[PDB]
């Protein structure tokens, strides 16, 4: 959509190839973010709790 | 931790709903400001305060 | 790890197709392959463990310069996952494929003079498991092949009974042997007992389990492929298919 | 004629060269900061009476849920910390760890292996030697502190040279009596009861007068790059324990009375910018060491 | 044969048989968590230029309000503490305060009175005898680092027995000169500037050649369970503070510089198991003295 | 009568007389604050993602944001607080800031600059004088321990004397052998290792018999008012780091290995409790000296 | 035990201690910053027809408008960094240029005062002594590279000590034939043509063959924090420039050939670290002043 282009062209077009077309052409969502981990317990109540 | 997230959304609503009876505490002008997007006047006060 | 869980013959042979050789060496100073060493299992024993260090182990260690070096490198990899450190190899190699070094003459490496007992000596063969001793009698026949040393191959396997009987069946020429074949010669993979987080003994052992425990993990991570799932999303080189042969053969 | 030196400089052992890369610091920070984690959740596990809290920060430590019967001690993390604290010691050490358990055990925080964030102060004091004539004996003891005894019984007084190194950055130095002290080559001044050296002014030059034994002693201050998460209290308890759990023990290695004389004694060394700095690695990995082994205690006396 | 030994070492007094049991444990706990509280509000009060939450640190520390023209002493808490103190140094001691404010206090926090959690290294040198011949002259000087001091005015050289207890785990040994140093019925070996030993392994026998005197300098480690909330810095600052407060101040008892001298010398006594749980309490109490006295000076 | 004294007593120079008023003690209470925050700001952006801790806590020190080109030093704060130690430390030094500067950087923080409301316990020992008989050799070593060994070649037992000012609250000495020790006109006790003494009370009297040489190891402590936030570990680092860097190079001045050694050398001159208030200022200045140049190294 | 040393290292005169601030910093950065403006300006002036670049160029450099019948001289910019310029050099000069006037100049441009975020290497050789024996010449000429010729007219071998200063990095040392070096008490090893040495090691004994001289060619490599615009080669002409133009002119001062025998010799003085800061301030004035010299002619 961005770059003129279509499937079969950026067909066997590795990750960092792609990156480098989207961020000339001024596109900067190219990476994945990470997502942090929130630590949970249960109380135990009747159980042993986890 | 699940239990530092869930203390700070219960006493966050009961601060909000308090402050928001009777006659608010904050005066419409800052309400128009925070409403601009499309929030209600509640929700954006919320989110300011955090 | 990658090298660890290819079950087949297939599979681990296209994987050796598509690895470089950079892959088998460390670049790691490492130490010395044979010594009596004192270690640390406190899960088990206040008292240092003892146990000896080995050349098939998930660790850098010092190996020999000549093809003698760089050929048990290769296998360790195969056989434990990590090589060996052999400094200054020539660029042409490094660049060069596993599967090329062991069954092409374009490189320029003499393995007409090597002997099997004394590389079964070194990469320690009393320790292996029968998964890696299998994966050791593969290497050693695409060496023959290319050497043209079939003979000494068979004079080897008739000295040791057991590695005859579960030797590999295969011709290092032929793609329809390969798939053929029905052997299993997966080390690392998803286990079918319950695996814990515990350490082990042996540094082979704790090794071993490092990378079972890995892999693991890596199957429940995004760089894992589910075939089921995402198989028009591979391309059409990667993707599986009835007629994929491998270059010559 | 007669030479003295410090007995904590002489012949400092070679130290490892493995797990000194990038990734390896990221797993010794790493382990810092969880074990950090681990001793405190373990003092609000006590305040609060419950185990939740330290039962979630051993979870994130070792990857597993204790059972109750079976002894903690760390997993992984703890078994891949006490064999890295051995390889930095020495040569000899078996250096048996893989690279995989070492990029997975990094990953856990988000965390940079930085050696060289900031400074930290060590108090030991180098003395290479102390030439002294034939008639006049020199006796030195101590390392954070150095008392050097000099007695002439020669008939006239006698100029003994100092060698305090060129690693030092300030040397002070205090006598029982008033003495003189000078660089070489220069004036005598007068007799005073304290100096403030430079080491790398150049070797000094004492006056023994005939009677009464001279006693001086001796304080020196070295600055070494240190990461921030340092903690030099915390880096001389995990040291007596590695060596009291018997993590040192390997064949032709010397045994230090502190981390204070083994930094200094390999500072004080051919290719000592080298050594330093894998020594420094080690002071952060006996750092985590002993806050882990203090809230997952196993020895029972 | 002449006998040397180390002066912190000599005579350990008996410790207190009070105050020992779960509930004072808890007690003390609870000081020394009621403490830091009150350090900590202090230094908040000074920040935020407001002295709120100093009064309900001092509430809940002494059950009444700070008065400006009243002192402000502590409250009972203190007054227990104090006693408390006294109580664990000697066996001469009063040990006046009832159970019933014992456990009235041991309420005010929720903290197990668990004291062996953990542990920590107490680097004092037990040197229990030198044993030397004729014409060899011994001296041991120090506790955290003990130098000893040998010469022989005989004509051949001289065997100096060293017993360093059973209780260190490591020690140690650095000499001025390069020494030969050996194990009982063992060969002696070549002459080096360092040795490492186990004290439990049998004594140890130094050549110790004619001229001139040959000093060696002595560095122990020993491991002590202690609880989790031992703090060194604090306690041997509590140690000081008592000693000059006077509560020390018992007849037929000893002195000592530091606490890990203190601690070492009750463990090396004819049965030093005993002594090591009461002296750890009261290392305890020390931190919670030091830290409630900063706060509250008189 | 020969006279040995300790060597870090002698001719203690005179302190500086600048930066003593009330806004002056704010500004280095305030040093010490966000000092504080710059050190822990740091460890928390380092354990995560993100530095905004660290801007947050630099922008409030330097009064600017940091920037990737220029380097760290600290801003105006770090000038000033530089200064003001040099200041302290010799009457000589000049005194560079203006009281405007002061008072500005003064006003960050809201904190009470209150220099004597806790106090610390320091392990300097001071040995005014040991006067000793004609036949008799006296050397003393070390401050934090003292080390008095006395040899006498005469024929009967000498008589020494020791002094050991006015100002330490306890000392404790140890020796190598059970000695004799008592007060001016006090009879003999029997030969004891160890002997606790208070200095108030008057010069002792020690026994020295003929051979045998007896050393004597004091360990004292002295009481010190300074503020809640006094650390003496960060103090001690802040001394070296100071020193190594040139903050008290002047002429005509003593240099000491320990800020303990600095501040016992104060107390025992002449005007000595005017001259210690100066110097636990500067002890705080150094405190906060020591954890902005860790966060910022140059 | 003759002593031969540089002539370039004697007698290191004081510098100014004046417009060494971080207003004054910024105003020789700025400075250097707008002569980079003006000589570019005045090239691509040349290049076109127009010269408005170098009339804009002119108005922010001299804040007035440049006229055809009227001289150019550079305006208030140029005549306070030529007052500058003298007060770095030595301390007598009369430093005559108010601080109002270099804030309001530095306020042109927006531009870090910092001097220490690079480097630069320089090449002046420092032979600080070469303590040669009896019977023995040493003659020690150059800066740059050293060439020094020793002759021994004596059949005994001489043992000669090289001094390097203990502040150079690494030294390299050519001979015309293999000679023989090693430290004080290491064995001396084979002839060799090269040496590569460490000055922090210590003196250097050289061996001397009795029947031909020996003459050794010296280089050595010294790093110095200078700042990121440094430009050694229009540093190096600015220095000759300014020595020309009577800049340097006062009484009780030594001269030096370049700016590398310049920042080296006082390196060298007692106090080489606070006198460098100043000289590689002086470096970058001086840099501004050759570009602003050479763009505008009077």
């Keep these: ?45 009747r159980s042993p709790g986890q | 931790t699940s239990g530092s997230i869930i203390n700070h959304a219960n006493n966050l609503n009961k601060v909000i709903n308090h402050v928001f009876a009777d006659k608010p505490l904050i005066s419409e002008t800052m309400l128009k400001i925070l409403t601009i997007d499309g929030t209600t006047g509640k929700d954006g006060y919320r989110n300011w305060l955090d | 790890m990658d090298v660890l869980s290819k079950g087949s013959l297939k599979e681990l042979l296209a994987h050796l197709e598509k690895t470089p050789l950079e892959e088998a060496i460390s670049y790691r100073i490492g130490t010395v392959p044979y010594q009596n060493v004192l270690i640390s299992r406190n899960e088990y024993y206040n008292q240092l463990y003892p146990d000896t260090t080995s050349l098939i182990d998930g660790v850098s260690r010092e190996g020999q310069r000549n093809v003698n070096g760089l050929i048990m490198s290769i296998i360790s990899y195969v056989v434990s996952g990590s090589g060996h450190y052999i400094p200054n190899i020539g660029f042409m190699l490094l660049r060069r494929s596993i599967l090329d070094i062991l069954t092409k003459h374009d490189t320029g490496l003499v393995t007409n003079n090597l002997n099997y007992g004394i590389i079964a000596r070194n990469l320690t063969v009393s320790k292996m498991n029968c998964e890696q001793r299998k994966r050791m009698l593969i290497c050693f026949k695409l060496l023959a092949y290319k050497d043209g040393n079939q003979n000494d191959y068979e004079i080897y396997l008739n ?11 295969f011709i290092p020429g032929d793609m329809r042997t390969v798939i053929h074949n029905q052997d299993q010669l997966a080390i690392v993979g998803i286990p079918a007992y319950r695996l814990t987080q515990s350490t082990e003994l042996s540094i082979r052992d704790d090794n071993a389990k490092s990378y079972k425990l890995g892999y693991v993990d890596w199957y429940n991570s995004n760089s894992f492929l589910r075939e089921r799932s995402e198989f028009n999303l591979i391309r059409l080189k990667d993707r599986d298919t009835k007629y994929g042969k491998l270059n010559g053969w | 004629a007669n030479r003295a030196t410090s007995a904590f400089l002489d012949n400092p052992h070679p130290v490892g060269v493995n797990y000194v890369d990038e990734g390896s610091r990221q797993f010794v920070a790493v382990a810092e900061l969880l074990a950090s984690k681990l001793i405190d959740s373990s003092r609000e596990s006590d305040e609060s009476n419950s185990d939740v809290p330290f039962v979630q920060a051993y979870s994130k430590f070792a990857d597993d849920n204790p059972r109750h019967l079976r002894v903690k001690t760390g997993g992984k993390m703890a078994n891949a910390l006490t064999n890295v604290i051995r390889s930095y010691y020495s040569i000899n050490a078996p250096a048996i760890v893989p690279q995989v358990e070492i990029d997975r055990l990094a990953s856990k925080a988000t965390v940079s292996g930085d050696m060289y964030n900031s400074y930290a102060i060590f108090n030991s004091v180098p003395i290479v030697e102390v030439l002294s004539p034939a008639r006049t004996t020199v006796s030195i003891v101590g390392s954070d502190r150095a008392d050097v005894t000099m007695l002439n019984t020669g008939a006239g007084a006698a100029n003994i040279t100092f060698n305090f190194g060129q690693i030092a950055e300030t040397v002070i130095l205090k006598g029982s009596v008033p003495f003189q002290l000078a660089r070489l080559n220069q004036p005598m001044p007068a007799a005073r009861f304290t100096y403030k050296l430079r080491p790398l002014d150049g070797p000094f030059i004492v006056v023994l007068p005939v009677g009464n034994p001279l006693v001086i002693s001796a304080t020196a201050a070295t600055r070494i790059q240190v990461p921030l998460a340092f903690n030099k209290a915390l880096v001389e308890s995990g040291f007596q324990t590695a060596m009291n759990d018997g993590l040192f023990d390997i064949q032709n290695v010397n045994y230090y009375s502190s981390f204070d004389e083994f930094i200094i004694s390999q500072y004080h060394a051919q290719d000592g910018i080298n050594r330093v700095s894998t020594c420094v690695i080690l002071g952060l990995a006996l750092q985590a060491y002993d806050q882990m082994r203090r809230a997952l205690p196993v020895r029972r006396v």
């Design chain 1, 1 to 45: 959509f961005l770059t003129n282009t279509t499937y079969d062209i950026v067909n066997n077009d590795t990750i960092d190839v792609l990156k480098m077309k989207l961020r000339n052409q001024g596109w900067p969502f190219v990476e994945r973010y990470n997502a942090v981990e929130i630590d949970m317990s249960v109380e135990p109540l």
């Design chain 3, 159 to 169: 000295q040791n009974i057991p590695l005859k009987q579960i030797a590999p069946n």
